[PDB]
Amino acid sequence: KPLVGTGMERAVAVDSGVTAVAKRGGVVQYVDASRIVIKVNEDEMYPGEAGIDIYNLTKYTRSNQNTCINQMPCVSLGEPVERGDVLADGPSTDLGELALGQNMRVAFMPWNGYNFEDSILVSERVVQEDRFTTIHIQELACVSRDTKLGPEEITADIPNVGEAALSKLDESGIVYIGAEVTGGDILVGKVTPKVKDSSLRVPNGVSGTVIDVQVFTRDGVEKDKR
């Protein structure tokens, strides 16, 4: 909630559709991270096609800078809600106001030369509550083309690989979601017939945790167990 606002945070917030704006006023009947259910006011509600509205939150998903983007509910159950107004803040939005960074206690002085040119100084307290912490998403893709001497298989069976590498994989040769993988480990077991190993791996020097695997298949070929 940036303390020294300018009043423009509201306009950018409402216009920037990162949030769940209320197309009409009324009350929320079901509140959840997944979605929201709104029973619009009867006067606001049309006589025909009356029904009730469902707002679908945008979940944890890939950004365009490999950052995280997600929407979260910000209203309790059975809560009055006004038309054209926030229901669930998006990233860096706060009750429908743009919250970009964070406000902190600050001081200006030379501290043992540690702030020589612009070298900002921060206490371990700031990191302790992780308020600066940020999330990033990495979308690693693998393709299965057909070369000469057979097609590219996706089997778990790979020659000359430790079982520990295979341990985190499944029956088909693809990792289970939620694995605390690290730089170097295999994700999908790809082999070029000859047979030679060409399995995908995490980039060197980057850890992470698998959030999801998307699979698409060229129309006219079968699918593995996973």
Binding site: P110, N112, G113, Y114, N115, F116, E117, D118, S119
Partner: protein, 209 residues
Amino acid sequence: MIKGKQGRFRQNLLGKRVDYSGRSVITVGPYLRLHQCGLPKKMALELFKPFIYGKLELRGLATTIKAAKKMVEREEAVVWDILDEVIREHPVLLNRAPTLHRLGIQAFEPVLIEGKAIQLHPLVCAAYNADFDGDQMAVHVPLTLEAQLEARALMMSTNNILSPANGEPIIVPSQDVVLGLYYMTRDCVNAKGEGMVLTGPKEAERLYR
């Protein structure tokens, strides 16, 4: 084959790329000394792989090179001792992208520092004219003992204190420490410690503290 950019002169005699090279954003670490520089431990790990392998097979921890590679990538305990040993005396080159004047490349002694940023001596930054806005400086490593001699003898900060353009010390303090020193040699007419006498500076510091 001879003409044009693809021509061998313009193809392979020009600004190339260099192995055993690194880069990152830089910080201060003032407690360091101008005869010496910081370097994130990980960079030391990857940079000196053959050196560590040589010391390893010298110690016979893993005779074959593949096993030694496995040990170092596992980041086993003994490897850090080897890293300190090789860094015992092995200066390296620090560099900035817009290399205008020759101090933009300079030799320094690394010290192993945790974190993920390079501590750089304050004053030399002025020679590098490199603010801490996020400037990403690069690092190179000499190989032959003659190159080590050149760096420690020619590109060493101790051997590079005055400008080539003229004799003024390029190591003049820039903005902050000068404020402190100015604060030193300035008089308030009346305060504590005004109007007495001392036998020496030592008791002066004693009374100040």
